[PDB]
Structures are given as structure tokens and as C-alpha cells.
Amino acid sequence: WKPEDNIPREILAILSKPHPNYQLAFLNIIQLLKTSISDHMYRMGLTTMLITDKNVDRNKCIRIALVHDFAESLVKEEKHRREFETVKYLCESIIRPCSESASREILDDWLAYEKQTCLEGRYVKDIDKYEMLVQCFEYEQKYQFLGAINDIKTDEVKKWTQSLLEDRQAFFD
Amino acid sequence: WKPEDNIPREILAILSKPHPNYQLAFLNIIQLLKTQRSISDHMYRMGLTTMLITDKNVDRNKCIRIALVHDFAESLVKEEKHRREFETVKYLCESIIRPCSESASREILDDWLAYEKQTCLEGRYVKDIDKYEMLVQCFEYEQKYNGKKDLKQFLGAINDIKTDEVKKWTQSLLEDRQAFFDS
Ligand SMILES: [Zn+2]
Ligand SMILES: [Zn+2]
């Protein structure tokens, strides 16, 4: 495989020339965030700000909730590896040139989500799930949840889902 | 006028309710921000753009937050228009953010204030980037043609940028656009 087979032809052309415009190349690879996971990650980022837990840097939480689904855009056993190498490629062939801190921190936050070596990654995955719960509920509000209270880690988002389920039982009747 | 006018009823029902689900209501308010002048997508591309700041003297966390909130007063939208957005941010904070995270309320209010009215370096950077990506938009559009172009959005860009770093980005971009038109 090759982690450029999905990078468009002309962005590849932009980066290959010596000392390219890595910023426009980024704002182009991102101006592709609409296929719409851009809204998804943005909404999750805004949601992270509501964590009561004192043991939280919600800034890293936003970082995680802004970069994690942003990997599966290009790209399982082969996946969460080759996704790792495409994140590697974006970090070291786009971000590392014109940004020192960002390449490192971005990769390690992507891992912090894709291995959950941090409480923030756990919160962000909890949110990727609980927002979808909200969406299923607000959908059937015009007319499936699957044990998802078990499928939540943290106690805080567990309580969020508990409130959501109370509202479910209110609605149906 | 008052901000409650520009708010869907379903959410107000979620709110004048005993044990209101403030998180669900916040998620609803966020889920109807998908709309452009999408603005959720605009703020997301902003959020990932601001991470490309290398002015070591900048809190890019506050940058990402200002970016992700600076245009959030937009479900509730002629000097009084900014009055309405200010009262809107305040209404959303005192009545939706305070009742579930008292600190996030004063974080969001002051991040929005740091943007629209400038207060920090992070605000300057986020504003410069809202202009920069619009410039990228216009250039890609102009590229999909032989030119014209659509000068008028470019006349005088390097003067609407306040930071050195984004001035540099914009200089590179204007160079490449002149290269396009030299063909
Ligand atoms: Zn997701
Ligand atoms: Zn903006």
C-alpha cells in the first residue's frame, strides 16, 4: 500500500517541489473534511468542554476530538496500523516541516486516542458514542440503542447517557 | 428583542422542564449550527489550521478554543447585530453552560470576547486565519478557471493580516496566486 495512493494528485504535486507551501497543502487536505465528519469532530470538540472531572485538561480533549476520526478519512488489523502510518505521513510530511511541536503532539494525541493511554482519549471515545446515542434518540423522536450504558467507560458520560435514557422513557410514553 | 426568539422551541421545552438535560440541549444547539454564510465545518477547518501555529509564544489550546467558539453566536442571527450576538453568547452561557459546568461558562464567554473584540494574541491569530482560509477558498475557485478572478477579494490582503506568522502564510499564498496568473 502506499500512504499517498489516497493523497490527491495535485496536492502531491504541491508538496514535492522544494520548500513548498505546506500551509495551503494542509488547508487543502483538510478542505476535504467534508465527506460529514468535520461537523462530527467539531461537535465532539465542543462537547468535551463540559467535563466536570477536575482530573481533565479539556484542551488535549479537544485536540483528540479534532484529530482522531480525521485519520480514517484517508483509510482493523491492517487499518489501525496503516491508519497509523498515514497519520505518520501527514505528521512528518506536512506538519513536521512547518511545525515542530505539532507533529509530535498530534501523533501522540492520535495514539492517546487509538490506545487510550490517557483519560482524555477515553472521554473523547465516550463522546463519539454518546453523541450517536443522542442522534438515535432525536431521530426516533419523529416516529437500536444496544446496551450502550455498558458500552460507555467514564462515570460522567455514563450519567449523561442515564439522563438521555430518562428522556427516552419520557418521550416514548 | 431577546435571544430566546432565535432558539427552537423543542430545546426550550427541554429547558423549562424539571431536571432539564442541559447536555442534550447544548448538543441540539450545536447540531443546528450546520449552516454557512457549514459554519461547524468552517470552525473545524479553523481549529485544525490554528494547530499549525509555530509562534512559540502562543497558547494554541486557547487558539483552538477561540476558533471553535468564535462564530458560535450564529444560530441566533445594524450595529445591534453584534449586540444580539453578544446577548446571545451571554444567554447561552448563563442558561445552558453555567447550570452544568460553571467554569466552562466563563471560559466560553471570555474566549468569544477574546475573538470578536480583540483581547489577546490568540484572538488576532484566529481572525487572521478566518481571513486566510477565505483567501485559500477564493484562490482555489480562481484556479478552477483560466482567470478571471475575482481580484476584489485580494486587493490588499497583506494589510488585513496582523500577525507575522499569518502574514508569512499569506505572502506565500499571494506569490503562488501570481504564479497561477502568469500562465
Ligand atoms: Zn467519530
Ligand atoms: Zn470564522
Q: Answer whether B31 touches A (CB < 8 Å).
A: yes
Listed residue (B38, B143, B65, B27) closest to A35, CA to CA = B38
| Interface residue A151 vs chain B (CB under 8 A) | no
Buried b (16+ CB within 10 A) or exposed e, B133-167: bebbebbeebeeeeeebeeebbeebeeebebebbb
Long-range contacts of B48-51 (CB under 8 A, 24+ apart): B48/A26, B48/A30, B48/A33, B48/A66, B48/A67, B48/A70, B49/A26, B49/A27, B49/A30, B49/B129, B49/B132, B49/B133, B50/B125, B50/B126, B50/B129, B51/A63, B51/A66, B51/A99, B51/A102, B51/A106
> Touching check for A166 and chain B: CB below 8 Å?
yes
On whether the CB atoms of residues B29 and B92 are closer than 8 A, the answer is yes
Cα–Cα separations (whole angstroms), residue B114 to B85, B122, B158: 14, 8, 22
Distance CA A29, CA A73 (A): 10
C-alpha cell at B49: 489550521
> What is the C-alpha to C-alpha distance for residues B135 and B170, in angstroms, rounded to an integer?
8
Q: How many domains does chain A have?
A: 1
Instruction: List the grid coordinates of A145.
Output: 440503542
User: For chain B, where are the alpha helices, taking DSSP H only?
Assistant: 9-15, 22-31, 39-50, 60-70, 80-92, 102-116, 121-143, 164-181
| Domain that includes residue A96, residue range | 1-173
Exposure class string for B28-47: b at 16+ Cβ within 10 A, else e? bbbbebbeeebbbbbbbbbb
Burial class (CB in 10 A: 0-12, 13-18, 19+), A129: middle
Q: Which residue has the cell 512547518?
A: A98
Read off the C-alpha cell for A56.
481533565
The Cα A42–Cα B49 span in angstroms is 13
Ligand closest to the CA atom of residue A131: 1
B19 touching A (Cβ < 8 Å)? yes
What's the CA gap between B20 and A173, in Å, rounded?
18
- Sequence-distant (6+) residues with CB within 8 A of B127 are B115, B118, B162
Are A39 and B43 within 8 A, CB to CB? no
Is the separation of the CB atoms in A107 and A87 below 8 Å? yes
Angle of helix B22-31 versus helix A37-48 axis, rounded to 10: 150
Sequence length of chain B is 183
Whether B52 and A106 lie within 8 Å, measured CB to CB: no
Q: Are B95 and B129 in contact (CB under 8 A)?
A: no
Nearest bound ligand to the CA of residue A126: 1
Cell readout for A132 is 450517536
Give the residue carrying C-alpha cell 494554541.
Answer: B60
CB-CB: which of A26, A50, A131 is closest to B104? A50
Q: What angle do CA A36, A37, A40 make, to 5 degrees?
A: 105
Residue A16, chain B, CB below 8 Å: the answer is no
Q: What residues of B are designated binding site for a divalent metal cation?
A: 42, 70-71, 74, 130
Query: Chain A: residue nearest B100 by CA?
Result: A50
Cell (9 digits) for A36? 460529514
State the Cα angle at A96 between A95 and A98, rounded to 5°: 75
At A145 the three-state DSSP class reads: coil
- Overall resolution, Å: 2.6
Q: Which of B29, B41, B133 to mutate to test the interface with A (most CBs of A within 10 A)?
A: B41
Are the C-beta atoms of residues B118 and B127 closer than 8 Å to each other? yes
Q: Distance of CA B58 to CAs A25, A166, B16, B51, B104, Å?
A: 23, 43, 41, 10, 21
What is the Cα–Cα distance from B81 to B155, expressed in whole angstroms? 27
Which of these, B132, B64, B156, B75, lies nearest to A28 by C-alpha position? B132
DSSP letter (8 states) at residue B95: I
CA B87 to centroid of ligand 1, rounded, Å: 32
H/E element holding A167? helix A155-172
Tell me the angle at which helices B164-181 and B121-143 cross, rounded to the nearest 10 degrees: 10
Task: Transcribe A51-98 into DSSP letters.
Answer: ---TT--HHHHHHHHHHSTTTTTT--TTHHHHHHHHHHHHIIIIIHHH
Distance CA B12, CA B20 (A): 10
Task: Please name which ligand lies nearest the alpha carbon of B68.
Answer: 2
Q: What is d(CA A56, CA A78) in angstroms, rounded to the nearest whole number?
A: 32
Which residue has cell 501555529?
B53
